[PDB]
Structures are given as structure tokens and as C-alpha cells.
Amino acid sequence: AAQPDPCSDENGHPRRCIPDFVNAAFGKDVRVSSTCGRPPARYCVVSERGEERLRSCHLCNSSDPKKAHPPAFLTDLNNPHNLTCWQSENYLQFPHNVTLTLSLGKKFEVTYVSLQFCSPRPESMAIYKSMDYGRTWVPFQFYSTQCRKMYNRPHRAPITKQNEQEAVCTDSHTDMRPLSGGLIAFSTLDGRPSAHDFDNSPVLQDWVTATDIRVAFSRLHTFGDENEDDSELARDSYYYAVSDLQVGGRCKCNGHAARCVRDRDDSLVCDCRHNTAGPECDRCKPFHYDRPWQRATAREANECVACNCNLHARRCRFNMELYKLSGRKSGGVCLNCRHNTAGRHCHYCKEGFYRDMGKPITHRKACKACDCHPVGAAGKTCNQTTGQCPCKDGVTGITCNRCAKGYQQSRSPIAPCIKIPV
């Protein structure tokens, strides 16, 4: 409304535009492996304060909305002082994997994934992404007190330039453990050495990109003393619960759009600009092949450029050697010049025709036929630039259609203009 076009300058010149930052999980329906309440079943909160165990107990009943704890409560608006949470099934045996999967449907770039717990935090969990609509999954971040044993990872691996795309493991989640309200937050870029100029890092750009997100919990904080780790069987306090799940980032458009939006088929997609196309504006638009696709940046917008064919070609092709040689200015090449033109830009007239000046090069019929005079000219093909036909001695005119001054017209087809003698 009162927002001017972000994809272009105040002079109409292109500039980079990126969709707004969002929690991309807000309002979304998250898929989970486990939820309490079917069949209804009692659970207990355990309480630590002093040296006393208040085992407070309530009923998870999925058919009772006052007592239901559905995945929906993960991405509803979170009001503290009145929290809602999803809560897993109870009595979790070990080993296990209680998964939450957020499917975005469209590549985003993600700056963080975060959760607020109603229960205590897991001893162990992981976060994973899919960059391909959920056919494959890839570790994003690990949390655990036995990184090695549980996930086979070094604890707290330093991140090198050599692999800053590396999913590390840590126990930082354990620092100062409350049993409620526990926050975990994975910033995709914390501690990655190229973070400072993300804009020019393609490796981080890949790292942070995903279409879906999975968090899996695989071990509960052991309580009840666990003096005998013998107690394999579980209890009604053996569940996870979460009040809010967020995935912070923005829609992936390579700096060539100001928003994503819902098409026909209800699918999210970039509103591509800069004469770009594809769901992420990952490629140039037709006939806009003057130079290579580039992702925009702070300084350069890198719009896709229309190749020039002076209105004599439908299609266009990019040629890198030409680009290279031009000093990376232009490499487009026209195909099937159409109005008896020829050349790279359909910018000159095929032999057999010539350049009708006073009409401009863009003009349908900027190329005129050689209509060389049968008897006055010495051949059929005229000068493509100038129109001039090859004239016999004594002849003039563009088409050789006249004797010159000093000459007299014969009725010989071979020699039609003879010089006045003296």
C-alpha cells in the first residue's frame, strides 16, 4: 500500500529484495509420532522444590479439549501465563524417537529453530532438515550428554573453514536445568566462520536452506534417583511436552523477490522479479539470456538481462565464451533472425538485401531487396550497408538505372551508356 517497490530503485533500477523474516512454523500443522490422550490416561508432573516430591497428576484426554494436548498447540500463538502444549504419549520406553516434523513446502533459508518445553528438556535430541520436500533428511544440530555414544559425534566439535557445514553436538541445553519453561534454540549460523559475509558464502547459503524440519527426542532426563538404572520400565512422568515451536527464517528467492505467495494448487512460491523465474527465482526468464543467472547481493541486484535482437528474433541463447570475451557484459545470441536480417543481434541485412536507412534497424522491413537493374548493373547482389549495385561504365543510380552525365543511352543490353566523344 504505502510501501514502494522494494525490488526496484526510486529510479526504477533493480535492487535486491528479500521476503520478510518469519517464524515459518506459525499456524502450521506439525506432524508428530506420539501424542497423549488416546486412550485417555493419567500423567504426573514431578516437582523438585527443597527435598519434597509433589507428584501432581492430571488426565490427558484427547477427546476433551480442556484436557487435550494436540500437536496444534505447538504453533498456536503462544501467550505465556496461559500456555498450551502438545505432549507425547506417556511411559516412553527406551530407546525411542518422538518426532515433530514441520513441512514448509518451499525452500526457506532458516536462521534458527527453537522450542519451549512444558516438561523438562530431553537429555538427548536432534534436529534435522530436508532440502528435498522430505525425501531425504540431514542432521542440523545435536543435543546430548553423550554425544559420542548416543549420536556417534564428537562432543562440541570445533567448526573449521574445512567443514563449516557440520552438524555439531553439545550439552548446552543441560546448563541450569529447570523442569519447566526450558528453552532450546539452534541458530544455524552461530559459530560458523563465514557467517559475517553470508551474503557471499554459498556454503552457508546451502547449509541454511531447507524445505522441512524434524526434531527428534531420544532420551528423557532420568529422575526418581535412578539409583538402580535397572529400572527399565517407565512411569507416568515419562513424557515430553512442548508449548511452542518456532522456525525462524525467510523464504528462499535469491534476492529476486519481495515475498512468496500461494499459487493455483495452494503452493507457496516466490513472486519472482528481475526477469527471473523458477520457484526460487533460480533461473532467468525466457529471452533474457544476456548474461548468466546470479543471486542478488547488497550491492549488485544481478537482474536477468534481455538479449537484443532488434525485434527480429523470438528466441535467444547465452554464450559464455562471448560473455567472457566481452568482459562479462553480454553473451546473448539471437536465433533465426526473421525479416531477412542476419548476425548476432539480427543487426544487418542478409546478402540479397540491404539496409533501408531512414527506417530504423528495429523496423520490420529495415532490410530492402537488391533490385539491381538487369541491364544497368554488372551483377545481382548489392552492397548490404549502402544498397549500391555494381554499375556498368556510364551508369549511375543506386540500382544502376540511368546513364551518367557525359553519357548517352544506347539500346544495347550489353553497353547501355556511351560517352559523348570529343
Ligand X SMILES: *[C@@H]1O[C@H](CO)[C@@H](O[C@@H]2O[C@H](CO)[C@@H](O)[C@H](O)[C@H]2NC(C)=O)[C@H](O)[C@H]1NC(C)=O
Ligand Y SMILES: *[C@@H]1O[C@H](CO)[C@@H](O[C@@H]2O[C@H](CO)[C@@H](O[C@@H]3O[C@H](CO[C@H]4O[C@H](CO)[C@@H](O)[C@H](O)[C@@H]4O)[C@@H](O)[C@H](O[C@H]4O[C@H](CO)[C@@H](O)[C@H](O)[C@@H]4O)[C@@H]3O)[C@H](O)[C@H]2NC(C)=O)[C@H](O)[C@H]1NC(C)=O
Does 413 participate in binding a second copy (rule CB under 8 A)? no
Window of 61-69, 173-181, 351-359, 369-377 that interacts with ligand Y by CB under 6 A = 61-69
Binding a second copy (rule: CB under 8 A), the pick from 113, 384, 387, 398 is 384
Residue 350: all three cell numbers together: 542478409
Closest approach of ligand X to the CB of residue 151, in Å: 10
Looking at the Cβ atoms of 302 and 384, the one nearer to a second copy is 384
Does 292 participate in binding a second copy (rule CB under 8 A)? no
3-class SS letters over 120-131:
CCCCEEEEEEEC
Binding ligand Y (rule: CB under 6 A), the pick from 64, 190, 197, 300 is 64
Does 63 participate in binding ligand Y (rule CB under 6 A)? yes
Window of 149-157, 225-233, 235-243, 324-332 that interacts with a second copy by CB under 8 A = 324-332
Binding ligand X (rule: CB under 6 A), the pick from 112, 137, 198, 323 is 137
Does 316 participate in binding Cl ion (rule CB under 5 A)? yes
Does 375 participate in binding a second copy (rule CB under 8 A)? no
Q: Which does 336 bind (CB under 5 to 8 A by kind): a second copy, ligand X, Ca ion, none?
A: none
Does 112 participate in binding ligand X (rule CB under 6 A)? no
Annotate each residue in 21-40 with x if it binds ligand Y (CB under 6 A) or - if it does not, as one string. -------------------x
Binding Ca ion (rule: CB under 5 A), the pick from 78, 145, 146, 209 is 78
3-class SS letters over the chain:
CCCCCCCECCCCCECCECCCCEECCCCCCCEECCCCCCCCEEEEECCCCCCCCCCEEEEECCCCCCCCCCHHHHCCCCCCCCCCCEECCCCCCCCCCEEEEEEEEEEEEEEEEEEEECCCCCCEEEEEEECCCCCCCEEEEEECCCHHHHHCCCECCCCECCECCCCCEECHHHCCCCCCCCEEEEECCCCCHHHHHHHHCHHHHHHHEEEEEEEEEEECCCCCCCCCCCCCCCCCCCCCEEEEEEEEEEECCCCECCCEEECCCCCEEECCCCCEECCCCCEECCCCCCCCCCCCCCCCCCCCCCCCCCCCCCEEEECHHHHHHCCCCCCEEEECCCCCEECCCCCEECECEEECCCCCCCCCCCEEECCCCCCCECCCCCCCCCCCCCECCCEECCCCCEECCCEEECCCCCCCEEECCC
Binding ligand Y (rule: CB under 6 A), the pick from 35, 61, 218, 340 is 61
Does 136 participate in binding ligand Y (rule CB under 6 A)? no
Does 236 participate in binding ligand Y (rule CB under 6 A)? no
Closest approach of Cl ion to the CB of residue 314, in Å: 7
Does 18 participate in binding Cl ion (rule CB under 5 A)? no
Residue 77: all three cell numbers together: 500463538
Q: Which does 78 bind (CB under 5 to 8 A by kind): ligand X, Ca ion, a second copy, none?
A: Ca ion
Does 23 participate in binding Ca ion (rule CB under 5 A)? no
Does 170 participate in binding ligand X (rule CB under 6 A)? no
Residue (of 38, 41, 39) closest to 59 by Cα position: 41
Closest approach of ligand Y to the CB of residue 90, in Å: 15
Does 286 participate in binding Cl ion (rule CB under 5 A)? yes
Neighbour count for residue 55 (Cβ, 10 Å): 11
For ligand X, the binding residues (CB under 6 A) are: 97, 99, 137, 216
For Cl ion, the binding residues (CB under 5 A) are: 286-287, 315-316
For Ca ion, the binding residues (CB under 5 A) are: 73, 76, 78, 84, 243-244
For a second copy, the binding residues (CB under 8 A) are: 319, 321-322, 325-327, 329, 333, 342-344, 348, 350-351, 378-381, 383-384, 390, 392, 408, 410-412, 414-415, 418, 421
